[PDB]
């Protein structure tokens, strides 16, 4: 994994000694062939993962991830180039050194052999995101947003730090490898259920779990685009990662600790989702339904059958870069009307019609339509949770008219209707920013045509 | 070089490439000695992967 | 890379891995064991050094 | 033990809750610190007699010296005390609680 | 209802409020050096006939 | 002062320290410790308003007091042990009076009240001294008496300075007071992993003066003492900002910084001792530490409060402050978690 | 007063009520006791009066607490024949919350000290129960 | 932190005070010289979890 | 824990038999690692002083890197040793006590019986 944390950490030395006008389109370039560079990682066998060294492996899971995550930068620098084009040169490179620090995080977050070098890069995370969030966020909200975002996930952590060295102590390791061959069954104890607990937590905030999931409407708002971007495309996704890692090592116990916390994701889901029905901030309606699609991933890692890995897998894939593109498209309008409110600028077809189109493929795509891997995902997590329970479908079912519901109306509001007339600063649409949106769509298209490299390790 | 800056990015890929391979003579030791994949050693062959 | 190489490169990984769990565990009951007893190099803390006692005849005999 | 330990123990006690429970002054804290510096002497003293630890016997002359030196520090913070306030009340020193 | 008020009320602002009450009340000291030494006497008090730590 | 003198009592400071640190005797012990309180005095003083004055004079007496009980500890020893070696004590009256006394010289609760008052009355440099190197010398004897050291004491004085260090520092505008309650916290960490590993508690003690060492020497290079002054960095010392938010991230635990590196191997020998509970609450318990670094670091680094008209005029003065170690210290304070096993040097 | 949870956790559980409300209000005495001296001793009362109420304030709320959360835990390890079983210290710990809150005259703290107090009191049953050491002795 | 700087440069600061059975001075004998030599003699060297 | 281990010969940072043991090379990562760590606070110094921050002292930063693995090749030596000490006193405990670690009897899966937990 060494061929790709090196350019990573080469891109801090081609941010800092760029000419001026040069730091947007080197660090473009040059991820863009770390993103080309990633494709390597599909080398995986349907027995062995593709085990590099000591520290360092990767699997049909993380390998998704993966490329993904080393996607995102290119996209996160196309998106964020504009608003902070005023700002001072010292502070883009900084900026841009959060993002490149990020991606080097979580590379090596998702490849993680051992599991407190996991802990130590999952909880590494933070950082860069937390300075991205509560320096170069627009409003005011954006200090409490990352100290919500902050200690949610060090609340939920620091029991998981004791869980982990508690398990190097007991079974003499935290090595992922060994740990599939010297796992032992975890009995029913108190102590076994909030070792359960402890294992877990963190990884229920950082989906987040319906109930924990308050940092998010204000962590994904509060941010700037490619916090945004890097929030709801990758860092949700580093939980549903974890628990898929760390529910080898939580059995039977897992088969009667799951129950409330399903019920808190199959509630969560229809009650998020219908919140999204009355938000009037759009950037926190696509928070929301983060929410509500992070809901399905963890139920179906909670009932852990393999048609429900795999289709959590590529529901997490599909959410990354579904929920990215709304992110951006939201972006696109918010750098024309300065504003959030999604019943501000309406009636948008009449004046952008190729980004009307861009929003109407999202949206689609948001409502899982076939044959999207949103779809894939969706479709294989309500086939493995109707194997767990049969009465389960209601609540799949009736979320999936919820969740066509507030794809379309966000479709209605924003786009259709009549255009608002006092708002005259609608620009025609740069070449940047329809750029960024097929970048976003069309691999998200092309994996339609090839789903299996996005369906995890049990393919 | 009047564009230095656009190797730094693929040499280190490749220098990173370097020590990848680097590392693999360093958990060489059950090369040919798997229960699987063990085999008498071809003419003018010294070891199976490098 | 061949999976000749992948197999053999991920059981020599396993083994040492296994290797360091095995010698952790070893590490933790040696520590147990030389905290409870006191018989080995660890845990070793100190008495009076017995160099520095006066082993010369005395002012009065009775000592 | 001997029964005069009890005494020279109960009077360093003593003189602790005079020190760990001030009225106004800081002469008598002093006062009642130096009072536990000559109980920690008597009573060093009556051990290093009792047991005939000969080298011992220059250990509370040492224990004497240094504390008293501490004394004369004391003192000296009493008299930077009392040229601020006119006194030396421990309740004007309360500049620091913010 | 429950997420703008009550799963905001449980978990954060009832944690933190705690945490600023607590904070609140332990740096509400008057400075007086009287008074820290009274409280050192209270705990060496408690520390031997109440938790008995000279045993 | 006279620099001479400046020089001759910052020697006989550390003369007292480095007594304590080399003596086999409780007596050189004693001595170490009077001479290191009797030198130390002046360097409060130095500025001499009444605030140095009242700090010098609280500190004189909660020293005082501990030494008194110190040597009441040895001579209690002296009794029952009928010897004088700086080793395990042979009576827990003697160890519970020793272990009280140390506890009162650094400050640990319910004996934590010196600590804000002293460092807010003294200059920086004085409370730098104070909360670096005067943690020194009693923890070097609690490394070599606990044989004899009571768990249930050591534990509770743990918990309760890392309690009530943590929420200190919350109602804190002052920086010095923020300083004073993250040491009874950091003291608290370091003696609740002294009697299961000592060299978990000498990882933490050097990992700690190193961050509050960068901590001081940014708050003397910026000449801020509160945090409002200290908002006013970003304006005339960009870079400052940058440190601080690195090392105050670093003093919370955050990974991948290094302050997250001794509790966490406090932890690391915690777990092994099947100590579950206590470890987790003391974790859970640090996040107001790390509460109040994200408060001094939103108002310093990740905004930018307004300043004044005048600070137009220092953007024509560099800095003209020796600023000692001030890289070294910002590098090791945050880059060191990847030498992580290094800590067997202190075995 | 080492022994007075020595003297409340002997006696097994849903057995002899009396007694171990009597326990449990001796401990949560003790406490208040503890919490009253280092009240007046920091912050200090305008007269001798005004401590000794504080000091029979704090002693009998907390005695009070300890009272009804021994004979709440009894009485439900009793109708339930569940001695072995954190649900009682569940109900005891909510009862010794509401206790706690009618003598703070309010109904959030009493709730939240409900909450708090039955998940601390159900942790004390487990700890109890699997052997769990807050002050754990050096083993390694 | 026993930093044994006695030992290392050879050095008798403070051992000479430390036990009774030390070199007094005159060849004064303590009252208790021969336990305290009996009690050190037999617990040299075996450590203080063995020495118990 | 080993502090009677290094009490025969005290404050010694490299003991003789640390020589037994092979030094770390100078292509070290941990090394080069702390000459990253010496440039680091080389370019700090720079920007604190409104220095040219690759510019300014090249021979100052130059003994930045020299200083910081001039005093961590020694560190490492010393770490080196300390585990190595560490090692051999593990390895020759076990050795002196053989009751105190039998050999167990490994059992193949043959035998091994293990509850099934069906998950459905
Ligand atoms: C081993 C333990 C070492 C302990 C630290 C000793 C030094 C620091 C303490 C005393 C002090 O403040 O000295 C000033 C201090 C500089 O600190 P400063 O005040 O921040 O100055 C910044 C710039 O130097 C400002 O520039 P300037 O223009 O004022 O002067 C240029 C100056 C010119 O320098 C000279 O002229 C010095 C040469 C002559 C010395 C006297 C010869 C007689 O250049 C330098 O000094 C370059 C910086 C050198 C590195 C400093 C840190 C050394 C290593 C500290 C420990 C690192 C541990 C890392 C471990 C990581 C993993 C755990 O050190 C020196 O000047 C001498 C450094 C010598 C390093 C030798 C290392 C190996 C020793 C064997
Ligand atoms: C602990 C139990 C609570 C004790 C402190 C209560 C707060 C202080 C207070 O009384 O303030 C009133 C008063 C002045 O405050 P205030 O004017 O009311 O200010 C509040 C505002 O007015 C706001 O108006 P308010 O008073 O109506 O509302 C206050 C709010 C009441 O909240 C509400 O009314 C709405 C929320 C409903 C209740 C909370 C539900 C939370 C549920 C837990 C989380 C979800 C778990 C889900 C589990 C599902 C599966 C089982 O309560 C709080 O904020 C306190 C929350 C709990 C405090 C302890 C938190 C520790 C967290 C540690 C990390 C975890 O302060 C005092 O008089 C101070 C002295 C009070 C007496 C001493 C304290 C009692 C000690 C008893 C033994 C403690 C054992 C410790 C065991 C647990 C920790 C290890
Ligand atoms: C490398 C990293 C360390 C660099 C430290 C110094 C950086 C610096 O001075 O940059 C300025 C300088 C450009 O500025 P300038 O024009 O010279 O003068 C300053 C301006 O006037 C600046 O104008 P200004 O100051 O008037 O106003 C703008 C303001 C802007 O500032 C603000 O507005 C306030 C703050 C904004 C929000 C906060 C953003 C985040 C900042 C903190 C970073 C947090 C994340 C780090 C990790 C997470 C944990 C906290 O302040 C600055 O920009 C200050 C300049 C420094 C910026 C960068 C700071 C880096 C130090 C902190 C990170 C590294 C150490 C900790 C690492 C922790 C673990 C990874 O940048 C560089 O030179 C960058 C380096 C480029 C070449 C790299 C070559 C590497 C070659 C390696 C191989 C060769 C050595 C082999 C050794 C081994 C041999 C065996
Ligand atoms: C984001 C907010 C919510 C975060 C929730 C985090 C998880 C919730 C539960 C955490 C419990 C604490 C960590 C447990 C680690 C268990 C490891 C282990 O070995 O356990 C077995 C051990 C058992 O000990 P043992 O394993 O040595 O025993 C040997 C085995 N037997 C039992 C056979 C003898 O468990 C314990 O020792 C105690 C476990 C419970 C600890 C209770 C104290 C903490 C209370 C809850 C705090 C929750 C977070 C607080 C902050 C909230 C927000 C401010
Ligand atoms: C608010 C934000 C959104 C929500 C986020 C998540 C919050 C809730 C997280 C924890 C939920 C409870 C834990 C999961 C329950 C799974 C099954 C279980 O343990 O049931 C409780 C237990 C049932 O009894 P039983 O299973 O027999 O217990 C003996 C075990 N060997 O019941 C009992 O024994 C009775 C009750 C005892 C006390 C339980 C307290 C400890 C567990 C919770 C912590
Ligand atoms: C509990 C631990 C101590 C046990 C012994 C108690 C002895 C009796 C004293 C009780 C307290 C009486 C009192 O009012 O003390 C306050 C007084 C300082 O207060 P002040 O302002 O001077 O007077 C107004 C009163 N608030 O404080 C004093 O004057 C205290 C003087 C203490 C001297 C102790 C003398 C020996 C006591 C017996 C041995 C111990
Ligand atoms: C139950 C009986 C408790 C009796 C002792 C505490 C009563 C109290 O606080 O008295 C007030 C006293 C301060 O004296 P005060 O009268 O305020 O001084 C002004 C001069 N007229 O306060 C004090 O003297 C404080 C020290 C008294 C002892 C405190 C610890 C023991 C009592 C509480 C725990 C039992
Ligand atoms: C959030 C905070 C969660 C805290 C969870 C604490 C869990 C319980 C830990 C203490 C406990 O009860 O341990 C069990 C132990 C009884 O087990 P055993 O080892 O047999 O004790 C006899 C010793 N001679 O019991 C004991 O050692 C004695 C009883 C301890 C009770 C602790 C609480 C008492 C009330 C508060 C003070
Ligand atoms: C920079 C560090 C420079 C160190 C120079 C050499 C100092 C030296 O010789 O130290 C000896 C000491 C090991 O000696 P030892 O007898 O084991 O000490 C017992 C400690 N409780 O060695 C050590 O303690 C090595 C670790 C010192 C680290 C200091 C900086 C952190």
Redesign the pocket.
Known sequence: MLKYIIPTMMLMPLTWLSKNSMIWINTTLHSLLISLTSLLLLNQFGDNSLNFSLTFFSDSLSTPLLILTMWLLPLMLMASQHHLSKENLARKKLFISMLILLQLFLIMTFTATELIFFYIMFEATLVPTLIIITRWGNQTERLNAGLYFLFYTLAGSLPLLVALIYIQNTMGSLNFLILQYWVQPMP???S???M??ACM?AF?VKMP????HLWLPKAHVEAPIAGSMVLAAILLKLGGYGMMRITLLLNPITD??????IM?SLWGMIMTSSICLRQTDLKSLIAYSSVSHMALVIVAILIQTPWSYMGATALMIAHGLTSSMLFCLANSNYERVHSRTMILARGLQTLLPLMAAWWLLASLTNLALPPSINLIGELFVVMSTFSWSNITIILMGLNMVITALYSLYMLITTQRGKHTHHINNILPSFTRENALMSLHMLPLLLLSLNPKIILGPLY | RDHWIHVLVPVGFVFGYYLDRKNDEKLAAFRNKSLLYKRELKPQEEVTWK | DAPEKNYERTMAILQIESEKAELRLKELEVRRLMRAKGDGPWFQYPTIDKALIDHSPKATPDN | MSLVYMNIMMAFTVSLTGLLMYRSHLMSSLLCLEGMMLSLFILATLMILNSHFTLASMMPIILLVFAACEAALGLSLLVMVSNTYGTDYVQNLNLLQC | LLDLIW?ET??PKTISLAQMKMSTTITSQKGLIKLYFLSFLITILISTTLLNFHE | MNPIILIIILMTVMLGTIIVMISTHWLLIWIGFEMNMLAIIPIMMKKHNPRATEASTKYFLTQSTASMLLMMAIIINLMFSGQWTVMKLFNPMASMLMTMALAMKLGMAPFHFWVPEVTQGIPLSSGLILLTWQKLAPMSVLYQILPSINLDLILTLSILSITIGGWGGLNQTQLRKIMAYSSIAHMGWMTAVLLYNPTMTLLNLIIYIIMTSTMFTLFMANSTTTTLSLSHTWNKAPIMTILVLITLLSMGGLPPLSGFMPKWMIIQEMTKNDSIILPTLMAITALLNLYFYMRLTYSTALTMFPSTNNMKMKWQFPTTKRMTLLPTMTVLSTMLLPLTPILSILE | AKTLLHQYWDIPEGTECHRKTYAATSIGGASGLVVSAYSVALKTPTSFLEGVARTGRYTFTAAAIGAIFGLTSCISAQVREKPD???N??IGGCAGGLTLGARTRSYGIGAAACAYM??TA??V??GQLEGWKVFAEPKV | PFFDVQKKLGVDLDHWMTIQSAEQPHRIPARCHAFEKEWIECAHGIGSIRAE | MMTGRQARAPLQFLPDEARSLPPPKLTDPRLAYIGFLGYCSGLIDNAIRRRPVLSAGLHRQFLYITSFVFVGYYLLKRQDYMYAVRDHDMFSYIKSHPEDFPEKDKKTYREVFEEFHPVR
Not at chain 1, 256 to 261: E, L, S, V
């Open positions: 029913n104890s108190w076994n259920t909030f359960w607990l937590m229920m779990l319906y109930g924990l009667f600790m799951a129950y409330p916390f808190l | 799963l449980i978990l | 079983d954190p649900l210290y569940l039955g998940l159900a942790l049953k487990m």
